[PDB]
Amino acid sequence: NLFQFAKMINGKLGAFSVWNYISYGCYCGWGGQGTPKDATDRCCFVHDCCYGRVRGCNPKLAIYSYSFKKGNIVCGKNNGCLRDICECDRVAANCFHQNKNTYNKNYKFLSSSRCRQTSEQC
Amino acid sequence: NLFQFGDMILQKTGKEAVHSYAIYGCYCGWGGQARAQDATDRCCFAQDCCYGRVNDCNPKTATYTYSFENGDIVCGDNDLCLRAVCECDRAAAICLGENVNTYDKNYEYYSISHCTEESEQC
């Protein structure tokens, strides 16, 4: 669920990091249309596509097994759809970390008017 | 999509979702576990269950057609999944609007260190 995704993000990037993704670009957080603006925004777009392929359960409510092992996120012994959801979150948190130094504060809290491009396809 | 749900929230509650509901309680924000803290939070959990019944599209990126008329939110899509997502968002925005009288800012950023009770179930 998002509680766990937040723990992955803060565990990988540092305390309070999750709040930087509440609304960023066209896809991180409260967006969902247009073209990803940069690498961080693409991490979010891919994460949305990943959740969209999950069948069998609800990514927002599903509680999966995972843990950090020596700084690395490891999805645990999950069955079916839980495996998939955990993997979506793991990949996205690592993606946010990989691209942390390209985070553009000017992309926070964008209005939908900045995302009026033909929405990209998964 | 969430830009659109944010617009419905603006119309019904007067608040900017990305600075309010987006970080609220155990279900409006990055939670999905624990107890819904109040009526506002319960609206979000109910929305999560409504979204859980949507599989053909991802509610986050389903860009639907809607309008405001006669004090209602009218979902006008012909595409079945876009219509379904719009109906989930309409019900949630209306619910949030009915409960802003008990909106408690103390539940903002709450998920980080709470939401450990027995979780809500659909």
A84 is in an annotated binding site: no
Contacts 24+ apart (CB under 8 A), B4-8: B4/A32, B4/A112, B4/B63, B4/B64, B4/B66, B4/B86, B4/B89, B5/A30, B5/B89, B5/B92, B5/B93, B6/A30, B7/A112, B8/B66, B8/B73, B8/B89, B8/B90, B8/B92, B8/B93
Distance, CA of B74 to CA of A73 (rounded, Å):
43
Chain centre distance of CA A18: 10
Q: How far is CA B91 from CA A27, B1, B69, in A?
A: 23, 14, 15
CB contact under 8 Å between A109 and B2, yes or no, is: no
At B45, phi and psi to the nearest 5? -60, -45
Nearest chain A residue to B113 by CA distance is A3
Does A119 touch chain B if contact means CB atoms closer than 8 Å? yes
- Chain A residues with CB under 8 Å of B57 CB are 52
Task: Say if CB B107 and CB B37 are below 8 A apart.
Answer: yes
Q: How far off is chain A from B23, nearest CA to CA, in Å?
A: 8
Instruction: Count the Cβ atoms, other than its own, within 10 Å of residue B19.
Output: 12
Instruction: Count the Cβ atoms, other than its own, within 10 Å of residue A63.
Output: 15
Question: Strands (DSSP E) along chain A, which ranges?
Answer: 23-24, 28-29, 66-69, 72-75
For residue A120, give the amino acid letter: E
For residue A30, give the amino acid letter: W
Residue B5: give its domain's CATH number: 1.20.90.10
Structural domain for A72, as ranges: 1-122
CB contact under 8 Å between A58 and B61, yes or no, is: no
The b-or-e profile of A79-103 (16+ CB within 10 A means b, else e) is eebbbbbbbbbbbbbbbbbeeeeeb
Residue A43: give its domain's CATH number: 1.20.90.10
Structural domain for B117, as ranges: 1-122
Total of domains in chain A: 1
